[PDB]
């Protein structure tokens, strides 16, 4: 029937893309994440994995390789990469935990 | 109350009429930022005087900052009798409502400006 | 060790970790992707997303910067990062950085 | 094993005493190179005879190459009985080290040369 499920990974990427697309259409250019859009994502649906709302630009300027204030699909995915790392690495120096 | 120890050296200037507050380092600082770390930056405050307010560089992710910032205690030596400087260390975890993890105060009336006041003052966690 | 209930984004990136723990437990250690498990992973779970299921040895060598034939919980995630861009790019990669 | 299908037409030549191997094309080829477009070409291989070897044209980024290359099976038709030929397809992205994806074999000893041998031979994978 209609609405048939896809492969595990295909379903997983569809979910994140859906959330990515909804936030990539807040300011403009539904494909990239602007300053407010990028911050709106973390300061709403990600206050646990990464607790930082005061130095968001610190992340943007460390992920954007072109520095145009608009995190493209590739640049935005860079956040997800480090996010998945921060769940296993965290602060492997003093305290990590989960 | 415990916040560690702060090594500092105070010298007086008679040309600009102020006390040179130069701190060396602070150790045994408590952690605030999740992960056993903190962003402790000392900011000097005063009593009703309020003729001075300087914040040091944000020492992000550290428990022992070594920068040796210079604070200009803009107040005539003649007004040191009724002037008590307080050094409060603030955290900057950049998420939670970080506050004063500790502070220290010294009555300049008791302290003489004969030469230099170099010592290792103990810090206390005087929460607000 | 293990994680407790998280949010949408966190769980969306955790679900891929579950796949890892189930695949990396055939050869040895549930925290290291071996060679057989890697081959059975791409030639079963990622045969469509990943167009290369033959030169896996090339991928393995490019991911394992340790060259010890042990994809730890870090180097293995690089594969997920590559297949993630395989939906936007196709041959616009590889290059050579020394 | 599955490698697709190969269409070809074989004919014999008695003036030079050899078999003219003319392949039309190969379809349903598996993916090997990134992007889903491998660079596969066919390389003729023989049994201990090894009195023949030819490399075809490299067809880059295609899982359905149509060139119709010609191979000269230099060997008397009388020796076709003890002459088993195999056709292996190799891909080369010019970067990764991979092997033959698949191949097909035909026993000439069981194939008479009355006129021509045209058929849609099945392609099967053959890990080396």
In the numeric block, the tokens 């469509």 are attached to C48
Q: How far apart are CA D10 and CA D23, in angstroms?
A: 8
D95–C94: do the CB atoms touch at under 8 Å? Answer: yes
CB pairs under 8 A between A and C: 67
Q: Report the residue from A46, A73, A81 with minimal CB separation from C88.
A: A73
Please state, in angstroms and as integers, the Cα–Cα distance from residue B91 to each residue in A90, C56, D29, D65, following that order: 20, 48, 62, 66
Do residues B27 and B5 make contact, with C-beta atoms less than 8 angstroms apart?
Answer: yes
- In chain C, what are the helix, strand and coil shares in percent, each to the nearest 5? 40, 0, 55
On whether B11 is known to bind a ligand per the annotation, the reply is no
CB contact under 8 Å between C94 and D31, yes or no, is: no
CA C81 – CA C16 distance, rounded (Å):
12
Torsion D53-D59-D60-D63 (CA) sign: negative
Measured distance CA(B51)–CA(B45) in Å, rounded:
9
- Of the residues C12, C22, C87, the best mutation for testing chain A's interface (the one with the most A CB atoms within 10 Å of its CB) is C12
B21 forms bridges with which residues in the sheet?
Answer: B10, B71
Structural domains of chain C ordered from first start: 1-98 (1.10.238.10)
Report the Cα–Cα distance between both ends of chain B, in Å, rounded. Answer: 13
CB under 8 Å to D3, separation ≥6 — which residues?
D28, D29, D30, D89, D101, D102, D103, D104, D123, D124, D125, D126
CB contact under 8 A, B36 and A52: no
Q: How far apart are CA C49 and CA D128, in angstroms?
A: 25
* Cα-only R_g, chain C: 14
Find the CB nearest B34 among A51, A54, A55: A51
User: Would the CB atoms of A55 and B31 count as touching at under 8 Å?
Assistant: no
Closest by Cβ to A53, choosing from B35, B37, B95: B95
Residue whose C-alpha is closest to residue C3's, from A15, A87, B35, A46: A87
CA distance C26 to D73: 48
B116-123 β-sheet, strand order: B70-74, B18-27, B4-13, B116-123
Task: Provide the chain D residues 13-32 that lie in CB contact (below 8 A) with chain C.
Answer: 30-32
Solved how? Answer: NMR
Contacts of C81 (CB under 8 A, 6+ apart): A77, A81
- The residue ranges of every structural domain in chain B are 1-128
Q: Are C51 and D36 in contact (CB under 8 A)?
A: yes
Q: What topology does CATH give the domain B1-128? A: Immunoglobulin-like (2.60.40)
Segment 26-65 of chain C within 8 Å of chain D by CB: 51-55, 57-58
Please enumerate, by residue number, every residue of A annotated as part of a binding site for Ca(2+): 32, 37, 64, 66, 68, 70, 75
3-class DSSP state of D94:
coil
Which residue does chain A place closest to B62, by CA atoms?
A94
Residues D95, D98, D102, D103: is their CA dihedral positive or negative? positive
Q: How far apart, in whole angstroms, are the C-alpha atoms of residue A57 and residue A37?
A: 12
Which residues sit opposite D66 in a β-bridge?
Answer: D25
Q: D touches which chains (3+ CB pairs under 8 A)?
A: C
DSSP C55: S
B58 touches A: beta carbon within 8 Å: no
Q: Which of B35, B92, B93 has the CB atom closest to A91's CB atom?
A: B35
Helix (H) or strand (E) holding C12: helix C8-23
- List the beta bridge partners of residue B54: B44
């Amino acid at each position: 029937m209609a609405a048939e499920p896809l492969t595990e990974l295909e379903e997983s990427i569809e979910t994140v893309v859906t959330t990515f697309f909804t936030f990539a259409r807040q300011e403009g250019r539904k494909d990239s994440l602007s300053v407010n859009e990028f911050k709106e994502l973390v300061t709403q649906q990600l206050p646990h994995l990464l607790k930082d709302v005061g130095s968001l630009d610190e992340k943007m300027k460390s992920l954007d390789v072109n520095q145009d204030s608009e995190l493209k699909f590739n640049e935005y995915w860079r956040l997800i990469g480090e996010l998945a790392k921060e769940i296993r690495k965290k602060k492997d120096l003093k305290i990590r935990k989960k | 109350e415990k916040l560690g120890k702060l090594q500092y050296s105070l010298d007086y200037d008679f040309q600009n009429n102020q006390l040179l507050v130069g701190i060396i380092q602070a150790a045994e600082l408590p952690a605030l930022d999740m992960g056993g770390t903190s962003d402790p930056y000392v900011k000097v405050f005063l009593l009703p005087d309020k003729k001075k307010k300087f914040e040091t560089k944000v020492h992000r992710k550290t428990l022992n900052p070594v920068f040796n910032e210079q604070f200009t205690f803009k107040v005539p030596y003649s007004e040191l009798g009724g002037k008590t400087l307080v050094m409060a260390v603030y955290d900057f975890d950049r998420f939670s409502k970080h506050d004063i993890i500790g502070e220290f105060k010294v009555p300049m009336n008791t302290v003489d400006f004969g030469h230099v006041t170099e010592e290792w003052r103990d810090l206390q966690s005087a929460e607000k």
